[PDB]
């Protein structure tokens, strides 16, 4: 990607990168006073409490859900380091409807080996590159229970858009800083 941008500039062109295929979404507001349709969309995205996060595959069917729940979440494009740290520290699997910590490759192999996933790094790979079994791997992952940001939210009022000096909405690449603070 770095070389493509350098070569396109050298040839008088502009290299347009591929759009992001993955977002990380964190619920930012509590459960009091939520409109029913955003409430339903939050339940469908498994954001049942404040500071719960999930990975979402970017399609037209999910971008509209994100647009619906924009005032109540902060989301963006996660990086490999963010995903690796999230899975290593707060990675829990859903086995027999139970929240089981991913402390050994045996659990991951036993529950996801039919899809070719043998280790926590295979799981991270399927998350970062949205593979054929992203739905199964992401639903195997229990929703991440994050803390409050360690250095604060950076704003005096959270419930404005990130463009307008608030917190909610698509902050794109800055979700990495926010989530590493909250992790």
């Amino acid at each position: 990607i770095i070389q493509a941008k350098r070569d396109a500039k050298a040839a008088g062109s502009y290299y347009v990168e591929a759009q992001h295929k993955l977002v990380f979404v964190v619920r930012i507001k509590g459960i009091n006073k939520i409109p029913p349709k955003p409430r339903k969309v939050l339940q469908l995205l498994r954001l049942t409490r404040i500071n719960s996060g999930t990975f979402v595959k970017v399609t037209k069917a999910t971008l509209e859900l994100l647009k619906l729940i924009e005032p109540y979440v902060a989301y963006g494009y996660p990086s490999y380091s963010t995903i690796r740290q999230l899975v290593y520290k707060r990675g829990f699997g859903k086995i027999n409807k139970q929240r089981v910590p991913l402390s050994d490759n045996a659990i991951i192999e036993a529950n996801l080996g039919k899809y070719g996933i043998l280790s926590i790094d295979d799981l991270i790979h399927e998350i970062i590159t949205v593979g054929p079994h992203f739905k199964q791997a992401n639903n195997f992952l229990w929703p991440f229970k994050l803390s409050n940001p360690s250095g604060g939210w950076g704003v005096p009022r959270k419930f404005k858009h990130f463009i307008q000096g608030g917190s909610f909405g698509n902050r794109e690449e800055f979700i990495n800083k926010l989530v590493k603070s909250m992790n």
Binding site: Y14, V16, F162, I163, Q164, N170, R171, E172, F174
Partner: protein
């Protein structure tokens, strides 16, 4: 925040029988690239009939000040919103960078005109090459040959609650 200047070049999405659409470039003052892209789509929708869902961002690049350690006079032509319409304003700002001048302008608009970032439009920031074209007195008074001025009544900050001497304001 502390502003940066970007160039944002975008276009309509390519279609069959209309390939290679025109590229449009804007110079945007913003704190970050997310704000810069949002402002670009706002202005592109306001001027052309291009929507974010119908187009794409070809490129966004930060533009640095060419000579950040040279003092310059800037003429800033801005346009702000009112219920009667949009009104022009021309201000002159002496500073060492375009982003510094734009930040000074935004602070001055917030102080005086009670204006906000979403309502203020920057139409032009242009350096004045020759001092003879400067026509604001608060800028012209600093262009005097051999400019010297004192700073009477210096107030020194104290680190302690009680002082054992009466303070002096000499400088």
């Amino acid at each position: 925040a502390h502003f940066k200047e970007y160039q944002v070049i975008g276009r309509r999405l390519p279609t069959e029988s209309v390939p290679e659409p025109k590229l449009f470039r804007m110079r945007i003052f913003a704190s970050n690239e997310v704000i810069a892209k949002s402002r670009y789509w706002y202005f592109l929708q306001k001027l052309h009939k291009v929507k974010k869902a119908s187009g794409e961002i070809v490129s966004i690049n930060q533009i640095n000040e060419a000579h950040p350690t040279k003092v310059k006079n800037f003429g800033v032509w801005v346009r702000y919103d009112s219920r009667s319409g949009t009104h022009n304003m021309y201000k002159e700002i002496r500073d060492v960078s375009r982003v510094a001048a734009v930040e000074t302008l935004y602070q001055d608009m917030a102080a005086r005109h009670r204006a906000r970032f979403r309502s203020i439009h920057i139409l032009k920031v242009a350096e004045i090459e020759k001092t003879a074209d400067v026509k604001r007195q608060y800028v012209k008074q600093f262009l005097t040959k051999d400019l010297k001025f004192p700073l009477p009544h210096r107030v020194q900050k104290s680190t302690k609650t009680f002082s054992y001497k009466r303070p002096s304001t000499f400088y």
